[PDB]
Amino acid sequence: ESGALPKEAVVQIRLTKKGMIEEKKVTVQELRELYLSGEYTIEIDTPDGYQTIGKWFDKGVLSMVRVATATYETVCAFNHMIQLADNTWVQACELDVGVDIQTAAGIQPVMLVEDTSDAECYDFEVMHPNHRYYGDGIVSHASGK
DSSP states (O other), X not given: OBOOEETTOEEEEEXXXXXXXXXXEEEHHHHHHHHHHOOOEEEEOOTTSSEEEEEEEEEEEEEEEEEEOSSOEEEEXXXXXXXXXXXXXXXXXXXXXXXXXXXXXXXXXXXXXXXXXXXXXXXEEESSTTOEEEETTEEEEOSOO
């Protein structure tokens, strides 16, 4: 159980370097490149506001699933944890149509769940006790827990 995402997933980040600040959307592929440059402190947007990324994880190749609500769609690892309306966590592959989940637009029910092809994926630590972030607009758990 973690928060693993493929290269094409979109997140909202804030870069800081010696007084310079930049905020923008990036793909996880771009995020990895920015992280590995070592030039920035990187924060990610979360339901707890911007929170700092600590460790990074290259996760190898994992099974993937596509999950969509009316507003958002993510392709994520089968064991990528998504936050239900009641604050508890469920693996993406265990979601079923109708389940209410937390998104950047509030609670929305899942409309689509579809297994897809194995892909390279990535995870990271968020330095907040809720350990969560927005991944493709859906509230996701960062790392294990």
